[PDB]
Amino acid sequence: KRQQRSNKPSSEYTCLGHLVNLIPGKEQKVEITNRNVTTIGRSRSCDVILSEPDISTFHAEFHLLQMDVDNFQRNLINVIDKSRNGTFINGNRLVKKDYILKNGDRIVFGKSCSFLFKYASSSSTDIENDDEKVSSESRSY
Amino acid sequence: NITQPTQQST
Asked: How far is CA B8 from the centre of its chain?
């Protein structure tokens, strides 16, 4: 007789954003799904498992939301710190319990662990055949 | 998967 029924585990929801770990000896890329809630720490159950010997299990939580308006999809990220070890976002200490994170945002967990967040959308393109024309305020040089 | 809880830092 078997000893397994139904589905308990749950992962690989839907691609949306990623986390890049800035290290002077390497780099680490993490995948962020539309789980509404993301866990960061040492707990394997958490969303993102850092490589720190003293990384808080509940270190921090990230809210991944995806909504469609007009035609495209607008995603927003929220940072929540339980307050215990030490989490720094945007190079500054967090005080509020409802920080809004967007594309191109540097995040630091603990003190040394530093990573940048950016939306993955689906599949980026190269800058070899992608010219940037001035009209919708894209650049200024 | 059993991981060590939170700890103190320097």
From this structure: 8
Residue A86 to residue B7, Cβ atoms within 8 A: no
What are the structural domain ranges in chain A? Answer: 1-141
Domain A1-141 bears CATH identifier 2.60.200.20: yes
Task: Mention every residue, 6+ apart, whose C-beta is less than 8 A from residue A53.
Answer: B7
In a 13 Å sphere around the CA of A77, the CA atoms on its Cβ side amount to 25
Chain B residues with CB-CB distance to A54 below 8 A: 6-9
Using a 10 angstrom Cβ sphere, with 0-12 exposed, 13-18 middle and 19 or more buried, the burial of residue A9 is exposed
CA distance A90 to A132: 28
Which residue in chain B has the smallest CA separation from A40?
B6
